Amino acid sequence: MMLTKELVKEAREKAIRMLEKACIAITDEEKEKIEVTDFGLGVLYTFGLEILVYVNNERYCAKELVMFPRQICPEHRHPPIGSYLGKQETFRCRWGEVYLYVPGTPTPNPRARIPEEKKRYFTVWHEIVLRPGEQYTIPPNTLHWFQAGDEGAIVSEFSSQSIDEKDIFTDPNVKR
Amino acid sequence: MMLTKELVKEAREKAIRMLEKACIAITDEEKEKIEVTDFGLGVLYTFGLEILVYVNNERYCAKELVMFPRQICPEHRHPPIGSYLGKQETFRCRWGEVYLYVPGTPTPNPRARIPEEKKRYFTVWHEIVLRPGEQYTIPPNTLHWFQAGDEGAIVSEFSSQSIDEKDIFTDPNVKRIP
Ligand SMILES: [Mn+2]
Ligand SMILES: [Mn+2]
């Protein structure tokens, strides 16, 4: 299965509707530029993310992450690059709910549900549940992953410079 | 007149309602912590701002600025501090509309309406109108001010580290720290 132009358009339209439902104004030019990634894994609705970048420069970045129901962001970390410390980010759930996993003691009875054969590539299990208004901050170079709840989620990212191409994923099949 | 605890509570409640109308979730703990400033000028509803800080650290900052109808943020700039370049910020109008003024050729027929006797302390007049979804970025140490439209405005800030206490205002009557 492959990320086609038709799948991308469908995903953009779904994400645009979710943003509208959450009352988040988006320009026509931004609507066209929403990034759709299946992380190269060919199952967008299982592993994938729809991203609106508000601003990204050498000094700060802000994005809106849209997630369809139970969409999963595969495990990654944002490493130092040259003398750049690496991206630190704060997430704020805006709508729906998200299950975020970071290093720490495994939480019993985690909310996330991962395909059995992909569990090997999820290694952190300390759970943070974020509902609308709630936040959490990930230091640079820290492993993390997240899955939206059964209605999906919109999660804001506020961070230092983003360099998506340099992110390191646990799953060696991922191409960002 | 001075900013009392009752005036602060009233302003917080109004700003909370405006956030709810814009569907922006805020926690009970954030409701108590919204900053209300009249910039020390004693006319909150003319000059003033209601601020929710989402995050502010050495590496980045994000805030929600709530503005009542025609509330004005007095002219200031975010200067370098030591070796810190100074705050760069991007504004994004979320709701309502805002009239932002930056250095440049004065725009004829500006939308803003400033009290006659305070005009002397507004020195930049190049107009940027932001409606919901629209953004503008102010480089560090750049003079700027803004006024909300007749329905008010909610404006997001995304920026490098914020150090409000170091901001320099054109109006010498302003005290940022209440
Ligand atoms: Mn991340
Ligand atoms: Mn400013």
Side-chain angles (χ1 to χ4, degrees):
Chain A
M1 312 263 259
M2 321 214 74
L3 201 53
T4 62
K5 286 181 182 171
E6 313 74 53
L7 178 46
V8 170
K9 173 191 211 274
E10 176 187 292
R12 289 197 171 125
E13 289 174 1
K14 181 165 205 199
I16 291 163
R17 294 190 308 269
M18 281 181 74
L19 291 164
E20 291 173 341
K21 180 101 69 57
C23 323
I24 297 162
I26 172 179
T27 75
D28 288 340
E29 303 76 3
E30 278 173 336
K31 276 172 181 182
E32 291 165 4
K33 280 160 187 189
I34 290 172
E35 176 183 27
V36 179
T37 180
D38 71 340
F39 297 99
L41 298 182
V43 277
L44 179 67
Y45 292 99
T46 297
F47 300 107
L49 205 51
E50 292 73 46
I51 305 162
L52 165 54
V53 176
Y54 295 126
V55 58
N56 182 30
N57 57 59
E58 299 182 333
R59 302 189 70 192
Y60 54 88
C61 175
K63 313 183 183 188
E64 208 64 76
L65 314 178
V66 175
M67 300 177 84
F68 307 141
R70 297 282 172 175
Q71 244 185 340
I72 298 156
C73 179
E75 175 178 285
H76 60 289
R77 66 182 205 268
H78 308 295
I81 302 159
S83 61
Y84 177 57
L85 272 166
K87 187 177 83 172
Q88 177 175 123
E89 61 193 353
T90 296
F91 290 125
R92 178 184 185 92
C93 179
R94 297 298 195 162
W95 186 100
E97 71 182 12
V98 63
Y99 313 126
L100 165 65
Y101 293 83
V102 298
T105 59
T107 311
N109 293 308
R111 309 293 317 277
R113 287 189 61 83
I114 298 307
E116 186 64 36
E117 70 292 350
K118 282 293 189 179
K119 282 170 176 175
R120 52 182 81 249
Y121 303 125
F122 294 83
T123 65
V124 298
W125 285 94
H126 186 79
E127 180 179 79
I128 310 295
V129 175
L130 299 175
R131 295 187 168 96
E134 294 178 339
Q135 299 192 162
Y136 194 79
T137 297
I138 300 178
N141 205 35
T142 299
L143 290 169
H144 62 292
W145 58 273
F146 39 104
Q147 181 184 45
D150 292 317
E151 298 187 286
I154 297 166
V155 182
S156 299
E157 163 185 331
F158 310 114
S159 65
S160 57
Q161 181 179 17
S162 188
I163 311 163
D164 291 347
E165 316 87 82
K166 292 282 199 272
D167 290 344
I168 302 168
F169 288 82
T170 302
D171 186 341
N173 297 280
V174 165
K175 322 210 168 297
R176 181 50 189 86
Chain B
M1 49 163 185
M2 230 282 284
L3 199 55
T4 62
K5 258 162 182 146
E6 312 75 53
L7 280 175
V8 169
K9 172 176 111 89
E10 184 190 7
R12 287 193 172 127
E13 290 173 354
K14 182 169 211 182
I16 295 160
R17 293 187 312 265
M18 284 183 76
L19 290 160
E20 293 173 345
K21 185 110 69 166
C23 326
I24 297 164
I26 62 184
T27 76
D28 288 339
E29 189 196 302
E30 282 172 334
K31 279 172 180 181
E32 307 301 340
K33 279 157 38 108
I34 291 167
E35 174 179 22
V36 177
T37 179
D38 69 340
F39 296 100
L41 297 184
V43 278
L44 180 65
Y45 293 92
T46 291
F47 299 110
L49 206 52
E50 296 68 51
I51 306 158
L52 169 56
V53 176
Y54 297 126
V55 60
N56 181 28
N57 58 60
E58 51 289 343
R59 301 192 67 200
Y60 54 88
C61 175
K63 313 183 184 184
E64 207 62 77
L65 314 174
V66 177
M67 305 181 77
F68 309 138
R70 298 271 175 178
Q71 248 184 337
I72 300 155
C73 178
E75 177 177 282
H76 60 288
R77 67 183 203 269
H78 308 296
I81 299 158
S83 63
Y84 177 57
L85 273 166
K87 187 179 78 174
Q88 176 174 122
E89 62 191 354
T90 296
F91 289 128
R92 175 184 187 88
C93 179
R94 294 301 195 158
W95 186 96
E97 74 182 18
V98 61
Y99 313 129
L100 168 63
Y101 295 82
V102 296
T105 303
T107 311
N109 299 316
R111 309 231 187 191
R113 291 287 178 277
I114 295 308
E116 183 64 38
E117 286 180 55
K118 279 294 191 179
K119 281 166 182 182
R120 60 193 96 255
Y121 301 124
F122 292 85
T123 65
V124 297
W125 286 91
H126 185 80
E127 182 175 81
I128 309 296
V129 174
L130 301 175
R131 291 185 170 97
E134 295 176 339
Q135 300 190 158
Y136 194 81
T137 295
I138 303 179
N141 205 33
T142 301
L143 291 160
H144 63 291
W145 60 274
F146 43 97
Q147 179 184 51
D150 292 314
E151 303 181 297
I154 299 168
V155 183
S156 295
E157 166 185 331
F158 311 115
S159 68
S160 60
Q161 181 178 20
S162 190
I163 314 175
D164 285 356
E165 319 84 85
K166 293 309 191 74
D167 289 345
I168 301 168
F169 291 80
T170 303
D171 187 340
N173 296 283
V174 165
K175 327 148 203 302
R176 180 61 187 86
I177 309 165

